[PDB]
Amino acid sequence: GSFVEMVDNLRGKSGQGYYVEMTVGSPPQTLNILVDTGSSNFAVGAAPHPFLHRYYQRQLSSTYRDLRKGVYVPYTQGKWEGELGTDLVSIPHGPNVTVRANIAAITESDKFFINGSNWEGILGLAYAEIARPDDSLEPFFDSLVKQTHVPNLFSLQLCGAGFPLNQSEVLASVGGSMIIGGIDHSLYTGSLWYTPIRREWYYEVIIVRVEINGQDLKMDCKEYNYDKSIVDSGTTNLRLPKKVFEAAVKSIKAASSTEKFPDGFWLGEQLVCWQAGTTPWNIFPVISLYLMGEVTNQSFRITILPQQYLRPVEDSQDDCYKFAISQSSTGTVMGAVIMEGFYVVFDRARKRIGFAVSACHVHDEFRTAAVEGPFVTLDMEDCGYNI
Numbered sequence: 001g002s003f004v005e006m007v008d009n010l011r012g013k014s015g016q017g018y019y020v021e022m023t024v025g026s027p028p029q030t031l032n033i034l035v036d037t038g039s040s041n042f043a044v045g046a047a048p049h050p051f052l053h054r055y056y057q058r059q060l061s062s063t064y065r066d067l068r069k070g071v072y073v074p075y076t077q078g079k080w081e082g083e084l085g086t087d088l089v090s091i092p093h094g095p096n097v098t099v100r101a102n103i104a105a106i107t108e109s110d111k112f113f114i115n116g117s118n119w120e121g122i123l124g125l126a127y128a129e130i131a132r133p134d135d136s137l138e139p140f141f142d143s144l145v146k147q148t149h150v151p152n153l154f155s156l157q158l159c160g161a162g163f164p165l166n167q168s169e170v171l172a173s174v175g176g177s178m179i180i181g182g183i184d185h186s187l188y189t190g191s192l193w194y195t196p197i198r199r200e201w202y203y204e205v206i207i208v209r210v211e212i213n214g215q216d217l218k219m220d221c222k223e224y225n226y227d228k229s230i231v232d233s234g235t236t237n238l239r240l241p242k243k244v245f246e247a248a249v250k251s252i253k254a255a256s257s258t259e260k261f262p263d264g265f266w267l268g269e270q271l272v273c274w275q276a277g278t279t280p281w282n283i284f285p286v287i288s289l290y291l292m293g294e295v296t297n298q299s300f301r302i303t304i305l306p307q308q309y310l311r312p313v314e315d316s317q318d319d320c321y322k323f324a325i326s327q328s329s330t331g332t333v334m335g336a337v338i339m340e341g342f343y344v345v346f347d348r349a350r351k352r353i354g355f356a357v358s359a360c361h362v363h364d365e366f367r368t369a370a371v372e373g374p375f376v377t378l379d380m381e382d383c384g385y386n387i
């Protein structure tokens with residue numbers, strides 16, 4: 001329905017992540033926490049770091065409980081180490097509940113905290129299977145549902161500004177909404193279409209067809225989900241498996257061939273700039289991802305614009321961007337630049353993810369993002385990768 005208390009509770013941007021205010025401990029210690037559907041731990045800075053202006057101080061919390069266990073998390077882009085415990089946790093612009101949750105108190109880290117991101121921890125919203133050190137460490141959302149009457153569902157509306165936000169603007173700007181326990185109808189237009197959650201670990205989905213400006217990429221659909229496809233608010237880009245990325249970039253280059261861009265742009269490294277207001281959106285194609293539907297032999301599609309996959313960056317008065325589609329060796333990742341086009345419903349109760357056009361997606365007068373269906377699609381189970 002309507003969840004006014006939770007609307008506009010996020011801040012941030014696709015490159016540095018979107019965060020929500022939370023409190024930990026007694027008396028409550030306020031922290032900004034990145035919303036991450038690509039991990040399953042609640043982990044917060046708990047020791048001084050040059051990029052943190054605040055951190056969780058366990059000795060100041062009367063409700064802190066030490067689990068006497070460490071946790072070491074090395075990942076591709078960095079690492080963090082911490083100490084496990086539990087404490088009382090709340091979300092001020094959330095459900096009016098307080099729960100006892102696991103917290104990994106980060107004591108050491110490398111390339112984890114981002115200078116100027118304004119967040120001090122991460123809220124892993126995925127399933128226990130991928131929790132660290134193992135699946136016995138109950139994730140925050142599982143604790144929230146078990147201890148309260150909050151429905152087993154959350155929904156995210158990530159709002160890209162469509163232009164760069166400076167240090168002050170990004171702190172003053174509304175970055176979107178995280179609706180805990182429901183769907184807020186003011187955040188989207190049109191209908192919600194649902195895709196099954198293939199397996200409960202990451203939020204895994206199955207892509208069954210890909211188009212660039214209506215032209216079928218025509219790959220065996222198993223390539224689109226090799227080795228998995230996931231929805232991850234903690235990744236900035238739309239990441240595609242190597243072979244799919246190579247085919248998609250060739251097609252995007254062909255569609256936009258009236259302007260030549262350097263190799264560094266297509267590698268997502270180099271910015272491209274245009275005179276203020278002259279970004280040639282129309283030369284860039286729309287991209288449609290067809291997802292398995294809930295009905296047998298039915299799919300639907302989500303369509304994004306270059307206003308989603310070209311990420312605004314500061315250079316001058318020029319309008320500059322980076323190409324926010326990049327290669328992956330770990331499957332498709334529908335990151336924040338894709339989520340910015342849609343209101344995304346993580347319906348854990350019904351093992352499905354819903355998509356609708358976002359009320360805050362960036363577009364122009366000629367094209368809009370879309371969520372459309374149904375389409376007849378056969379043998380969609382064959383699109384899923386095994387082993």
Ligand SMILES: COc1nc(N2C[C@H]3C(=O)N(C)C(=N)N[C@@]3(c3c(F)cccc3F)C2)nc(C)c1F
Nearest residue numbers: 017036038039041043073075122124132232234235
């Ligand atoms: C919190 O706890 C854990 N965290 C991670 N993560 C992996 C990271 C990552 O690469 N992506 C793509 C990702 N989705 N999540 C990470 C992340 C961010 F989102 C944003 C900024 C920094 C980050 F480290 C955090 N993984 C495991 C296993 C955790 F226990």
